[PDB]
Amino acid sequence: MDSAPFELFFMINTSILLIFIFIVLLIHFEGWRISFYWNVSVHRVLGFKE
């Protein structure tokens, strides 16, 4: 089963690259969803977590 991502990075370097591209990209498309999902506090869930 897929789990333990932190350890996965120790495998290859690309792992961090891809995630870095997908992550930074997602936030771009999510930035707009912030409105539709205003009722929810998904963003805050990560804002404080990070």
CSV table of all heavy atoms in Angstrom, one decimal:
chain,number,residue,atom,x,y,z
A,1,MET,N,0.8,-1.2,0.0
A,1,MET,CA,0.0,0.0,0.0
A,1,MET,C,0.9,1.3,0.0
A,1,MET,O,2.0,1.3,0.5
A,1,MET,CB,-0.9,0.0,1.2
A,1,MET,CG,-1.8,1.3,1.3
A,1,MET,SD,-3.4,1.0,2.1
A,1,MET,CE,-4.3,0.3,0.7
A,2,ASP,N,0.4,2.3,-0.6
A,2,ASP,CA,1.1,3.6,-0.7
A,2,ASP,C,1.0,4.3,0.6
A,2,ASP,O,-0.1,4.6,1.1
A,2,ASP,CB,0.5,4.4,-1.8
A,2,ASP,CG,0.8,3.8,-3.2
A,2,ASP,OD1,1.4,2.8,-3.3
A,2,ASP,OD2,0.3,4.4,-4.2
A,3,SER,N,2.1,4.6,1.2
A,3,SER,CA,2.2,5.4,2.5
A,3,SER,C,3.6,5.8,2.8
A,3,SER,O,4.6,5.5,2.1
A,3,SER,CB,1.7,4.5,3.6
A,3,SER,OG,0.3,4.5,3.7
A,4,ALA,N,3.8,6.6,3.8
A,4,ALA,CA,5.1,7.2,4.2
A,4,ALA,C,5.7,7.9,3.1
A,4,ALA,O,6.7,7.4,2.5
A,4,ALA,CB,5.9,6.0,4.7
A,5,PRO,N,5.2,9.1,2.7
A,5,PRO,CA,5.8,9.9,1.6
A,5,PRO,C,7.2,10.5,2.0
A,5,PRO,O,8.1,10.5,1.1
A,5,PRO,CB,4.8,11.0,1.5
A,5,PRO,CG,4.1,11.1,2.9
A,5,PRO,CD,4.1,9.8,3.4
A,6,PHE,N,7.3,10.9,3.2
A,6,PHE,CA,8.6,11.5,3.6
A,6,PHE,C,9.8,10.5,3.3
A,6,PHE,O,10.8,11.0,2.8
A,6,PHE,CB,8.6,11.7,5.1
A,6,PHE,CG,9.2,13.0,5.5
A,6,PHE,CD1,8.4,14.0,6.1
A,6,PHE,CD2,10.5,13.3,5.3
A,6,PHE,CE1,9.0,15.2,6.5
A,6,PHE,CE2,11.1,14.5,5.6
A,6,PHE,CZ,10.3,15.5,6.3
A,7,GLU,N,9.6,9.2,3.5
A,7,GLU,CA,10.6,8.2,3.3
A,7,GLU,C,10.7,8.0,1.8
A,7,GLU,O,11.8,7.6,1.3
A,7,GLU,CB,10.3,6.9,4.0
A,7,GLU,CG,10.7,6.9,5.4
A,7,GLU,CD,10.7,5.4,6.0
A,7,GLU,OE1,10.0,4.6,5.4
A,7,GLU,OE2,11.5,5.2,6.9
A,8,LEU,N,9.6,8.2,1.0
A,8,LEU,CA,9.6,8.0,-0.4
A,8,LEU,C,10.6,9.0,-1.1
A,8,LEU,O,11.3,8.7,-2.1
A,8,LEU,CB,8.2,8.3,-1.0
A,8,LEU,CG,7.7,7.2,-1.9
A,8,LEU,CD1,7.4,5.9,-1.2
A,8,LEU,CD2,6.5,7.7,-2.7
A,9,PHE,N,10.7,10.2,-0.6
A,9,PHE,CA,11.6,11.2,-1.1
A,9,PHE,C,13.0,10.8,-1.0
A,9,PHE,O,13.9,11.1,-1.9
A,9,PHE,CB,11.4,12.6,-0.3
A,9,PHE,CG,10.0,13.0,-0.2
A,9,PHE,CD1,9.6,13.6,1.0
A,9,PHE,CD2,9.1,12.7,-1.2
A,9,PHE,CE1,8.3,14.0,1.1
A,9,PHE,CE2,7.7,13.1,-1.0
A,9,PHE,CZ,7.3,13.7,0.1
A,10,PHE,N,13.4,10.0,0.0
A,10,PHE,CA,14.7,9.5,0.2
A,10,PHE,C,15.1,8.6,-0.9
A,10,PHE,O,16.3,8.3,-1.1
A,10,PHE,CB,14.8,8.8,1.5
A,10,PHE,CG,16.2,8.6,2.0
A,10,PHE,CD1,17.1,9.7,2.2
A,10,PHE,CD2,16.7,7.3,2.3
A,10,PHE,CE1,18.4,9.5,2.6
A,10,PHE,CE2,18.0,7.2,2.8
A,10,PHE,CZ,18.8,8.3,2.9
A,11,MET,N,14.1,8.1,-1.7
A,11,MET,CA,14.4,7.2,-2.8
A,11,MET,C,15.0,8.0,-4.0
A,11,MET,O,16.2,7.8,-4.3
A,11,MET,CB,13.1,6.6,-3.3
A,11,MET,CG,12.4,5.8,-2.2
A,11,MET,SD,13.3,4.4,-1.6
A,11,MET,CE,12.3,3.0,-2.3
A,12,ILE,N,14.2,8.8,-4.6
A,12,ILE,CA,14.7,9.6,-5.8
A,12,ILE,C,14.5,11.1,-5.5
A,12,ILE,O,13.8,11.5,-4.6
A,12,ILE,CB,14.0,9.2,-7.1
A,12,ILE,CG1,13.6,7.8,-7.0
A,12,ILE,CG2,14.9,9.5,-8.3
A,12,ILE,CD1,12.9,7.3,-8.3
A,13,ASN,N,15.2,11.9,-6.3
A,13,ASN,CA,15.1,13.4,-6.2
A,13,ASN,C,13.9,13.9,-7.0
A,13,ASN,O,13.2,14.9,-6.5
A,13,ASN,CB,16.3,14.1,-6.7
A,13,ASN,CG,16.5,15.5,-6.2
A,13,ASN,OD1,15.5,16.3,-6.3
A,13,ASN,ND2,17.7,15.8,-5.7
A,14,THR,N,13.6,13.3,-8.1
A,14,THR,CA,12.4,13.7,-8.9
A,14,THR,C,11.2,13.8,-8.1
A,14,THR,O,10.3,14.7,-8.3
A,14,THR,CB,12.2,12.8,-10.1
A,14,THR,OG1,12.2,11.4,-9.6
A,14,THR,CG2,13.3,12.9,-11.2
A,15,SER,N,11.0,12.9,-7.1
A,15,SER,CA,9.9,12.9,-6.3
A,15,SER,C,9.5,14.2,-5.8
A,15,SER,O,8.4,14.7,-5.8
A,15,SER,CB,10.1,11.9,-5.1
A,15,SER,OG,11.3,11.2,-5.3
A,16,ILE,N,10.5,15.0,-5.3
A,16,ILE,CA,10.3,16.3,-4.8
A,16,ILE,C,10.0,17.3,-5.9
A,16,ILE,O,9.2,18.2,-5.7
A,16,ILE,CB,11.6,16.8,-4.0
A,16,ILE,CG1,12.0,15.8,-3.0
A,16,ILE,CG2,11.3,18.2,-3.4
A,16,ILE,CD1,10.9,15.5,-1.9
A,17,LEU,N,10.6,17.1,-7.1
A,17,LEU,CA,10.3,17.9,-8.2
A,17,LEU,C,8.8,17.9,-8.6
A,17,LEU,O,8.1,18.9,-8.6
A,17,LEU,CB,11.2,17.5,-9.4
A,17,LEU,CG,12.6,18.2,-9.5
A,17,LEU,CD1,13.5,17.6,-8.5
A,17,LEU,CD2,13.1,18.1,-10.9
A,18,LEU,N,8.4,16.7,-9.0
A,18,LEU,CA,7.0,16.5,-9.4
A,18,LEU,C,6.0,17.1,-8.4
A,18,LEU,O,5.2,18.0,-8.8
A,18,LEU,CB,6.7,15.0,-9.6
A,18,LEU,CG,7.3,14.3,-10.8
A,18,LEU,CD1,7.1,15.2,-12.0
A,18,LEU,CD2,8.7,14.0,-10.6
A,19,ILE,N,6.1,16.6,-7.2
A,19,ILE,CA,5.2,17.1,-6.1
A,19,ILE,C,5.3,18.7,-6.0
A,19,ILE,O,4.3,19.3,-5.8
A,19,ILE,CB,5.6,16.6,-4.7
A,19,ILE,CG1,5.3,15.1,-4.7
A,19,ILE,CG2,4.9,17.3,-3.6
A,19,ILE,CD1,6.3,14.3,-3.9
A,20,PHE,N,6.5,19.2,-6.2
A,20,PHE,CA,6.7,20.7,-6.2
A,20,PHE,C,5.9,21.3,-7.3
A,20,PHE,O,5.4,22.4,-7.2
A,20,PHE,CB,8.2,21.0,-6.3
A,20,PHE,CG,8.5,22.5,-6.1
A,20,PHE,CD1,8.4,23.0,-4.8
A,20,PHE,CD2,8.8,23.3,-7.2
A,20,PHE,CE1,8.7,24.4,-4.6
A,20,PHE,CE2,9.0,24.6,-7.0
A,20,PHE,CZ,9.0,25.2,-5.7
A,21,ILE,N,5.9,20.7,-8.5
A,21,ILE,CA,5.2,21.2,-9.7
A,21,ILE,C,3.7,21.1,-9.5
A,21,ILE,O,2.9,22.0,-9.8
A,21,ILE,CB,5.6,20.5,-11.0
A,21,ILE,CG1,7.1,20.7,-11.2
A,21,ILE,CG2,4.9,21.1,-12.1
A,21,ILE,CD1,7.6,22.2,-11.2
A,22,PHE,N,3.2,19.9,-9.1
A,22,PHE,CA,1.8,19.6,-9.0
A,22,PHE,C,1.2,20.4,-7.8
A,22,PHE,O,0.1,20.9,-7.9
A,22,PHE,CB,1.6,18.1,-8.7
A,22,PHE,CG,0.3,17.6,-9.1
A,22,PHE,CD1,-0.2,17.7,-10.4
A,22,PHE,CD2,-0.6,17.0,-8.2
A,22,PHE,CE1,-1.4,17.3,-10.8
A,22,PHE,CE2,-1.8,16.5,-8.6
A,22,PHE,CZ,-2.2,16.6,-9.9
A,23,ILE,N,2.0,20.5,-6.7
A,23,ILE,CA,1.5,21.2,-5.5
A,23,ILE,C,1.4,22.7,-5.9
A,23,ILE,O,0.3,23.3,-5.7
A,23,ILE,CB,2.5,21.1,-4.4
A,23,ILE,CG1,2.4,19.7,-3.7
A,23,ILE,CG2,2.3,22.2,-3.4
A,23,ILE,CD1,1.0,19.5,-3.0
A,24,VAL,N,2.4,23.3,-6.3
A,24,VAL,CA,2.4,24.7,-6.7
A,24,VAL,C,1.3,25.0,-7.7
A,24,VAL,O,0.7,26.1,-7.8
A,24,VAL,CB,3.8,25.2,-7.3
A,24,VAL,CG1,4.0,24.6,-8.6
A,24,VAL,CG2,3.8,26.7,-7.3
A,25,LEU,N,1.1,24.0,-8.6
A,25,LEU,CA,0.1,24.2,-9.6
A,25,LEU,C,-1.4,24.1,-9.1
A,25,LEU,O,-2.2,24.9,-9.3
A,25,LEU,CB,0.2,23.1,-10.7
A,25,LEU,CG,1.3,23.4,-11.8
A,25,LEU,CD1,1.5,22.2,-12.7
A,25,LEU,CD2,0.9,24.7,-12.6
A,26,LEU,N,-1.6,23.1,-8.2
A,26,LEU,CA,-2.9,22.9,-7.6
A,26,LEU,C,-3.4,24.1,-6.9
A,26,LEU,O,-4.5,24.6,-7.2
A,26,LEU,CB,-2.8,21.7,-6.6
A,26,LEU,CG,-3.0,20.3,-7.1
A,26,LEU,CD1,-2.3,19.3,-6.3
A,26,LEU,CD2,-4.5,20.0,-7.1
A,27,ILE,N,-2.5,24.7,-6.1
A,27,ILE,CA,-2.9,25.9,-5.3
A,27,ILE,C,-3.4,27.0,-6.3
A,27,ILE,O,-4.2,27.8,-6.0
A,27,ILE,CB,-1.6,26.5,-4.6
A,27,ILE,CG1,-1.1,25.4,-3.6
A,27,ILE,CG2,-2.0,27.8,-3.8
A,27,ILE,CD1,-2.2,25.0,-2.5
A,28,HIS,N,-2.8,27.0,-7.5
A,28,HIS,CA,-3.2,28.0,-8.5
A,28,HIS,C,-4.7,27.8,-8.9
A,28,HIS,O,-5.4,28.8,-9.0
A,28,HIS,CB,-2.4,27.8,-9.8
A,28,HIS,CG,-2.3,29.0,-10.7
A,28,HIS,ND1,-3.1,29.2,-11.7
A,28,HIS,CD2,-1.5,30.1,-10.6
A,28,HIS,CE1,-2.9,30.4,-12.3
A,28,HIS,NE2,-1.9,31.0,-11.6
A,29,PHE,N,-5.1,26.5,-9.2
A,29,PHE,CA,-6.5,26.2,-9.5
A,29,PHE,C,-7.4,26.3,-8.3
A,29,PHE,O,-8.6,26.6,-8.4
A,29,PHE,CB,-6.6,24.9,-10.2
A,29,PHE,CG,-8.0,24.5,-10.5
A,29,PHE,CD1,-8.6,25.0,-11.6
A,29,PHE,CD2,-8.6,23.5,-9.8
A,29,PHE,CE1,-9.9,24.6,-11.9
A,29,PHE,CE2,-9.9,23.1,-10.1
A,29,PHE,CZ,-10.6,23.7,-11.1
A,30,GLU,N,-6.8,26.0,-7.1
A,30,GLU,CA,-7.6,26.0,-5.9
A,30,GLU,C,-7.8,27.5,-5.4
A,30,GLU,O,-8.9,27.7,-4.8
A,30,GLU,CB,-6.8,25.3,-4.8
A,30,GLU,CG,-6.8,23.8,-5.0
A,30,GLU,CD,-8.0,23.1,-4.5
A,30,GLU,OE1,-8.5,23.5,-3.4
A,30,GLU,OE2,-8.5,22.1,-5.1
A,31,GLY,N,-6.9,28.3,-5.7
A,31,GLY,CA,-7.0,29.7,-5.3
A,31,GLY,C,-8.4,30.3,-5.7
A,31,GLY,O,-8.9,31.2,-4.9
A,32,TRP,N,-8.9,29.8,-6.8
A,32,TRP,CA,-10.2,30.3,-7.2
A,32,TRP,C,-11.4,29.6,-6.5
A,32,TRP,O,-12.4,30.2,-6.2
A,32,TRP,CB,-10.4,30.1,-8.7
A,32,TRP,CG,-9.3,30.8,-9.5
A,32,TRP,CD1,-8.0,30.5,-9.6
A,32,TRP,CD2,-9.5,32.0,-10.3
A,32,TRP,NE1,-7.4,31.4,-10.5
A,32,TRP,CE2,-8.3,32.3,-10.9
A,32,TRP,CE3,-10.6,32.8,-10.6
A,32,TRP,CZ2,-8.1,33.4,-11.7
A,32,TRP,CZ3,-10.5,33.9,-11.5
A,32,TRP,CH2,-9.2,34.2,-12.0
A,33,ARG,N,-11.2,28.3,-6.2
A,33,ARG,CA,-12.2,27.5,-5.5
A,33,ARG,C,-12.4,28.0,-4.1
A,33,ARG,O,-13.5,27.8,-3.6
A,33,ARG,CB,-11.7,26.0,-5.4
A,33,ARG,CG,-12.6,25.1,-4.6
A,33,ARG,CD,-12.5,23.7,-5.1
A,33,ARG,NE,-11.5,23.0,-4.3
A,33,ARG,CZ,-11.5,21.7,-4.2
A,33,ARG,NH1,-12.4,20.9,-4.8
A,33,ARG,NH2,-10.5,21.1,-3.4
A,34,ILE,N,-11.5,28.8,-3.6
A,34,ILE,CA,-11.6,29.4,-2.3
A,34,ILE,C,-13.0,30.1,-2.1
A,34,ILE,O,-13.5,30.2,-1.0
A,34,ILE,CB,-10.5,30.4,-2.0
A,34,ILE,CG1,-9.1,29.7,-2.1
A,34,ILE,CG2,-10.7,31.0,-0.6
A,34,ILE,CD1,-8.8,28.9,-0.9
A,35,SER,N,-13.5,30.6,-3.2
A,35,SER,CA,-14.8,31.3,-3.2
A,35,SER,C,-15.9,30.3,-3.1
A,35,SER,O,-16.8,30.4,-2.2
A,35,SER,CB,-14.9,32.1,-4.5
A,35,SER,OG,-15.9,33.2,-4.3
A,36,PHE,N,-16.0,29.3,-4.0
A,36,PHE,CA,-17.0,28.3,-4.0
A,36,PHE,C,-17.0,27.5,-2.7
A,36,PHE,O,-18.0,27.1,-2.2
A,36,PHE,CB,-16.8,27.4,-5.2
A,36,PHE,CG,-17.9,26.3,-5.3
A,36,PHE,CD1,-19.2,26.6,-5.8
A,36,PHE,CD2,-17.6,25.0,-5.0
A,36,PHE,CE1,-20.1,25.7,-5.9
A,36,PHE,CE2,-18.6,24.0,-5.0
A,36,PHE,CZ,-19.9,24.4,-5.5
A,37,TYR,N,-15.8,27.3,-2.2
A,37,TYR,CA,-15.7,26.6,-0.9
A,37,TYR,C,-15.4,27.5,0.2
A,37,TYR,O,-14.7,27.2,1.2
A,37,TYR,CB,-14.5,25.6,-1.0
A,37,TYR,CG,-14.8,24.2,-0.6
A,37,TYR,CD1,-16.0,23.6,-1.2
A,37,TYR,CD2,-14.1,23.5,0.3
A,37,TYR,CE1,-16.3,22.3,-0.8
A,37,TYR,CE2,-14.4,22.2,0.6
A,37,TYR,CZ,-15.5,21.6,0.1
A,37,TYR,OH,-15.8,20.3,0.4
A,38,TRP,N,-16.1,28.7,0.2
A,38,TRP,CA,-15.9,29.7,1.2
A,38,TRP,C,-16.5,29.2,2.6
A,38,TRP,O,-15.9,29.4,3.6
A,38,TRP,CB,-16.6,31.0,0.9
A,38,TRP,CG,-16.4,32.1,1.8
A,38,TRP,CD1,-17.3,32.9,2.5
A,38,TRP,CD2,-15.1,32.6,2.2
A,38,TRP,NE1,-16.7,33.8,3.2
A,38,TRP,CE2,-15.4,33.7,3.1
A,38,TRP,CE3,-13.8,32.3,1.9
A,38,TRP,CZ2,-14.3,34.4,3.7
A,38,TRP,CZ3,-12.8,33.0,2.5
A,38,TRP,CH2,-13.1,34.0,3.4
A,39,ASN,N,-17.6,28.5,2.5
A,39,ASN,CA,-18.3,27.9,3.6
A,39,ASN,C,-17.3,27.0,4.4
A,39,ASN,O,-17.4,26.9,5.6
A,39,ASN,CB,-19.5,27.1,3.2
A,39,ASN,CG,-20.6,27.1,4.4
A,39,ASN,OD1,-20.6,26.2,5.1
A,39,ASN,ND2,-21.4,28.1,4.4
A,40,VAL,N,-16.5,26.3,3.7
A,40,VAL,CA,-15.5,25.4,4.3
A,40,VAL,C,-14.2,26.1,4.7
A,40,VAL,O,-14.0,27.2,4.2
A,40,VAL,CB,-15.2,24.2,3.3
A,40,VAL,CG1,-14.5,23.1,4.0
A,40,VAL,CG2,-16.4,23.7,2.6
A,41,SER,N,-13.5,25.5,5.6
A,41,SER,CA,-12.2,26.1,6.0
A,41,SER,C,-11.0,25.2,5.6
A,41,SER,O,-10.1,25.1,6.4
A,41,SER,CB,-12.3,26.2,7.5
A,41,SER,OG,-12.5,25.0,8.2
A,42,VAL,N,-11.1,24.6,4.4
A,42,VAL,CA,-10.0,23.8,4.0
A,42,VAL,C,-8.7,24.5,4.0
A,42,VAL,O,-7.7,24.0,4.5
A,42,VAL,CB,-10.3,23.3,2.5
A,42,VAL,CG1,-9.1,22.5,2.0
A,42,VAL,CG2,-11.6,22.4,2.5
A,43,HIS,N,-8.7,25.7,3.4
A,43,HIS,CA,-7.5,26.5,3.3
A,43,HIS,C,-6.8,26.7,4.7
A,43,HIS,O,-5.7,26.3,4.9
A,43,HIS,CB,-7.8,27.9,2.7
A,43,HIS,CG,-6.5,28.7,2.5
A,43,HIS,ND1,-6.4,30.0,3.2
A,43,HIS,CD2,-5.4,28.6,1.8
A,43,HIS,CE1,-5.2,30.5,2.8
A,43,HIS,NE2,-4.6,29.7,2.0
A,44,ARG,N,-7.6,27.2,5.6
A,44,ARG,CA,-7.2,27.4,7.0
A,44,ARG,C,-6.6,26.1,7.6
A,44,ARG,O,-5.6,26.2,8.3
A,44,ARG,CB,-8.3,27.9,7.9
A,44,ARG,CG,-8.8,29.3,7.5
A,44,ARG,CD,-7.7,30.4,7.7
A,44,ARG,NE,-8.3,31.7,7.8
A,44,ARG,CZ,-7.6,32.8,7.7
A,44,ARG,NH1,-6.3,32.7,7.6
A,44,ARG,NH2,-8.2,34.0,7.8
A,45,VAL,N,-7.2,25.0,7.2
A,45,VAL,CA,-6.7,23.7,7.7
A,45,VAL,C,-5.3,23.5,7.4
A,45,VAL,O,-4.5,22.9,8.2
A,45,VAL,CB,-7.5,22.6,7.1
A,45,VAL,CG1,-6.7,21.8,6.1
A,45,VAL,CG2,-8.1,21.7,8.2
A,46,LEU,N,-4.8,24.1,6.3
A,46,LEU,CA,-3.4,24.0,5.9
A,46,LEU,C,-2.6,25.2,6.3
A,46,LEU,O,-1.4,25.1,6.7
A,46,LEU,CB,-3.3,23.7,4.4
A,46,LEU,CG,-3.6,22.3,3.9
A,46,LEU,CD1,-4.4,22.4,2.6
A,46,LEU,CD2,-2.4,21.5,3.8
A,47,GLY,N,-3.3,26.4,6.3
A,47,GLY,CA,-2.6,27.6,6.6
A,47,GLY,C,-1.9,27.5,8.0
A,47,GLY,O,-0.8,28.0,8.1
A,48,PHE,N,-2.7,27.0,9.0
A,48,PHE,CA,-2.1,26.9,10.3
A,48,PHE,C,-1.2,25.7,10.4
A,48,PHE,O,-0.2,25.7,11.1
A,48,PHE,CB,-3.3,26.8,11.3
A,48,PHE,CG,-2.8,26.6,12.7
A,48,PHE,CD1,-2.6,27.7,13.6
A,48,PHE,CD2,-2.5,25.4,13.3
A,48,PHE,CE1,-2.2,27.6,14.9
A,48,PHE,CE2,-2.1,25.2,14.6
A,48,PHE,CZ,-1.9,26.3,15.4
A,49,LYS,N,-1.6,24.6,9.8
A,49,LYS,CA,-0.9,23.3,9.9
A,49,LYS,C,0.6,23.6,9.4
A,49,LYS,O,1.5,23.2,10.1
A,49,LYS,CB,-1.5,22.3,8.9
A,49,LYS,CG,-2.2,21.1,9.7
A,49,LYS,CD,-1.3,19.9,9.9
A,49,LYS,CE,-0.2,20.2,10.9
A,49,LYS,NZ,-0.8,20.4,12.3
A,50,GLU,N,0.7,24.2,8.2
A,50,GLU,CA,2.1,24.5,7.7
A,50,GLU,C,2.8,25.5,8.6
A,50,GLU,O,2.4,25.7,9.7
A,50,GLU,CB,2.0,25.0,6.3
A,50,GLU,CG,1.3,26.3,6.2
A,50,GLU,CD,2.2,27.5,6.4
A,50,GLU,OE1,2.9,27.9,5.5
A,50,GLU,OE2,2.2,28.0,7.6
